[PDB]
Amino acid sequence: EVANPEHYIKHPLQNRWALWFFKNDKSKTWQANLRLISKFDTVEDFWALYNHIQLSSNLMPGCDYSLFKDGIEPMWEDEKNKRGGRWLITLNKQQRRSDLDRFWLETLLCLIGESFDDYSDDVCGAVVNVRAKGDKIAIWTTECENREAVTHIGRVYKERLGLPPKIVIGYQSHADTATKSGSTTKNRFVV
Numbered sequence: 287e288v289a290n291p292e293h294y295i296k297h298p299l300q301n302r303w304a305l306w307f308f309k310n311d312k313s314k315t316w317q318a319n320l321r322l323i324s325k326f327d328t329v330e331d332f333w334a335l336y337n338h339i340q341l342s343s344n345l346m347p348g349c350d351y352s353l354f355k356d357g358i359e360p361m362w363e364d365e366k367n368k369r370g371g372r373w374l375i376t377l378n379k380q381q382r383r384s385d386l387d388r389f390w391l392e393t394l395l396c397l398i399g400e401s402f403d404d405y406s407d408d409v410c411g412a413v414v415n416v417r418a419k420g421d422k423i424a425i426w427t428t429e430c431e432n433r434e435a436v437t438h439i440g441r442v443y444k445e446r447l448g449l450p451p452k453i454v455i456g457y458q459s460h461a462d463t464a465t466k467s468g469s470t471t472k473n474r475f476v477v
């Protein structure tokens with residue numbers, strides 16, 4: 287003889303997530319400008335957070351928002367990111383108005399909804415970069431050598447965002463990040 291949980295319990299998410307903010311400051315290290323906002327693990331708590339913060343579209347150029355599974359820091363050095371990479375979405379200046387905010391929300395929902403099904407374990411989180419030269423959004427995965435998982439995640443993500451199918455996107459390995467003044471990171475896969 288107990289109350290029906292459907293009438294009062296919050297709707298749980300498979301994982302607990304953490305949202306981070308990056309504030310641009312040249313006089314300090316990258317890590318020093320990165321700070322945690324808060325965490326949540328239910329549908330209700332996700333909306334409570336999203337509804338009171340600024341849309342990416344309104345942030346000052348140079349700042350970022352990052353949503354990662356609790357325990358995984360949004361940086362290359364992390365145990366779960368060092369051997370991984372990211373599927374990169376490169377937006378033009380006009381998309382700041384038309385697609386940035388809509389794309390970022392769909393990205394958030396793809397993560398907390400575990401929309402990559404059988405390859406959910408390879409997903410680490412996502413990052414949106416607000417920049418004057420052109421905004422960027424990316425989904426980070428844990429292992430660049432897991433071809434099956436990486437290509438499936440890329441396909442689903444591209445489909446969910448809904449941009450024209452003829453547009454190809456690439457996946458970059460973090461370890462491959464350019465360090466030689468005169469080169470640029472190449473793509474491991476494309477979908």
Ligand SMILES: C[n+]1cn([C@@H]2O[C@H](COP(=O)(O)OP(=O)(O)OP(=O)(O)OC[C@H]3O[C@@H](n4cnc5c(N)ncnc54)[C@H](O)[C@@H]3O)[C@@H](O)[C@H]2O)c2nc(N)[nH]c(=O)c21
Nearest residue numbers: 316360361362363415417463464465466467468469470471
């Ligand atoms: C995600 N992330 C970014 N930075 C730092 O932030 C910078 C700007 O990275 P951004 O992702 O916010 O990208 P942004 O749009 O602001 O602009 P941008 O692409 O122009 O610059 C990064 C790129 O510059 C190039 N680069 C940096 N240093 C060198 C170098 N010595 N030689 C050749 N290319 C370089 C690379 O292609 C690199 O991917 C990086 O160059 C790096 O110091 C990080 N540092 C640590 N330690 N861990 C991280 O996880 C991290």
